[PDB]
């Protein structure tokens, strides 16, 4: 029995009031929140999958780049590509900063992020779950030996398949896969434990910059109690879900507007242009 929309929650004014009153908010983010930072998303015309279709045409499809059964067959394309998506030196967006402030004020239950760019950490968001893992560690496909990212980093930027140092040198599949979640893999245990704790505590869900096309993250809106209000902030509507309020557009533009309506420290996040103040 899927989640219907609440008839009594509709407007941007309603959204502001909820942000004012709610104190256990889940923010579910996807690649859209980093687009303004200079990191393209996955599924848009200028995104990762479109690029992969051009730069790696031999793949059965762009998704195969992040598919565990394909990686097992041939990990060479991924290690040719991985440095392109390795965390760089980008600055967090306004949306990241907004989420960080909510957490600072004690109002953020969790930021479930699908991104591997680590910008939530840079922004000082603490209550993060990296749903789709990260490059922070790597794990041998065969024996599950773990290493820190610095152990495979050199190989990654040299576009070479890093080798397990424990397994036999003649074991073909003894390769160190960074612990980014691929299609066909489990999400980190942290995700499942956090969701079990959070689902009956959340009092507001805000989805920002995601197409919610991948499970189980895409199941979050239907897994929480139906009465919990849901707000979408995204360039595109999500026709497969029933949000209460749909704010469609650039997420920094929309969050900027919400921040000014909230006032207090939220308006202060938007330091450009400069507001009226005494020197």
């Amino acid at each position: 029995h899927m989640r219907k929309k609440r008839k009594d929650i509709n407007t941007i004014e309603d959204a502001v009031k909820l942000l004012q009153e709610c104190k256990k908010i889940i923010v579910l983010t996807g690649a859209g929140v980093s687009v303004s930072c200079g990191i393209p998303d996955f599924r848009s015309r200028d995104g990762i999958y479109a690029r992969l279709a051009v730069d790696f045409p031999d793949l059965p499809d762009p998704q195969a780049m992040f598919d565990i059964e394909y990686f097992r067959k041939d990990p060479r394309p991924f290690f040719k590509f991985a440095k392109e998506i390795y965390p760089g030196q980008f600055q967090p967006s306004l949306c990241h900063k907004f989420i960080a402030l909510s957490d600072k004020e004690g109002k953020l239950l969790r930021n479930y992020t699908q991104n591997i760019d680590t910008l939530e950490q840079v922004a000082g968001i603490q209550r993060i779950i990296q749903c789709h893992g990260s490059f922070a560690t790597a794990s041998c496909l065969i024996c599950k030996y773990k290493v820190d990212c610095e152990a495979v980093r050199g190989d990654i930027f040299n576009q070479v398949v890093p080798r397990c140092p424990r397994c036999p040198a003649d074991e073909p599949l003894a390769i160190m896969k960074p612990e980014i979640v691929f299609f066909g893999e489990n999400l980190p245990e942290q995700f499942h434990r956090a969701m079990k704790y959070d689902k009956d505590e959340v009092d507001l869900l805000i989805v920002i910059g995601s197409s919610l096309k991948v499970r189980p993250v895409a199941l979050i809106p239907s897994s929480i109690p139906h009465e919990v209000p849901q707000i979408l902030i995204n360039r595109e509507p999500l026709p497969h879900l029933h949000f209460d309020v749909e704010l469609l557009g650039d997420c920094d533009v929309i969050i900027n507007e919400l921040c000014h309506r909230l006032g207090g420290e939220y308006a202060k996040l938007c330091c450009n242009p400069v507001k009226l103040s005494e020197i």
């Binding site: 929309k5 929650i9 509709n10 407007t11 941007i12 360039r235 595109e236 509507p237 949000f243 209460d244 309020v245 749909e246 704010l247 469609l248 557009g249 650039d250 533009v253 929309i254 900027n256 507007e257």
Partner: peptide, 26 residues
């Protein structure tokens, strides 16, 4: 910020269209 960044187009009861919405694309 962008042209008319603080304005939206409203489709009642609950949809707001801001700068950058994909609906503006061709």
């Amino acid at each position: 910020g962008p042209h008319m960044g603080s304005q939206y187009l409203f489709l009642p009861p609950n949809r707001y269209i801001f700068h950058g919405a994909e609906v503006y694309s061709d």
